[PDB]
Amino acid sequence: DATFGMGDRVRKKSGAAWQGQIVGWYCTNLTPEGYAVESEAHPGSVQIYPVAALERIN
Amino acid sequence: DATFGMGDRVRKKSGAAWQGQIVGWYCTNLTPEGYAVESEAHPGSVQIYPVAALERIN
Amino acid sequence: DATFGMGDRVRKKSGAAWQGQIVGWYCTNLTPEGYAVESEAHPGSVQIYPVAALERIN
Amino acid sequence: DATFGMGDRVRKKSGAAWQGQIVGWYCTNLTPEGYAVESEAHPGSVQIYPVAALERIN
Contact C39 A43 (CB under 8 A): no
Q: What is the CATH number of the domain that holds B36?
A: 2.30.30.60
Three-state DSSP class for D20?
A: strand
Instruction: Name the experimental technique.
Output: X-ray
Q: Which of A55, B30, B48 is nearest to B18 (CA)?
A: B48
For residues D56 and D29, give the distance between their C-alpha atoms in angstroms, rounded to a whole number. 23
What DSSP designation does D43 have?
Answer: T
**Phi-psi map region of A29: left, alpha, beta (phi>0 left; psi -120 to 50 alpha):** alpha
| Domain with A16 in it | 1-58
Distances (CA, A) of D32 to A5, B23, D28, D42: 35, 32, 5, 27
For residues D31 and D28, give the distance between their C-alpha atoms in angstroms, rounded to a whole number. 5
Resolution in Å, one decimal place: 1.4
* Residues of B (1-20) whose Cβ lies below 8 Å from A: none
In chain C, the number of structural domains is 1
**Cβ(A20)–Cβ(A5) below 8 Å:** no
Give the chains touching B; criterion: ≥3 Cβ pairs < 8 Å: A, C, D
Nearest to D19 among B16, B19, B42 (CB): B42
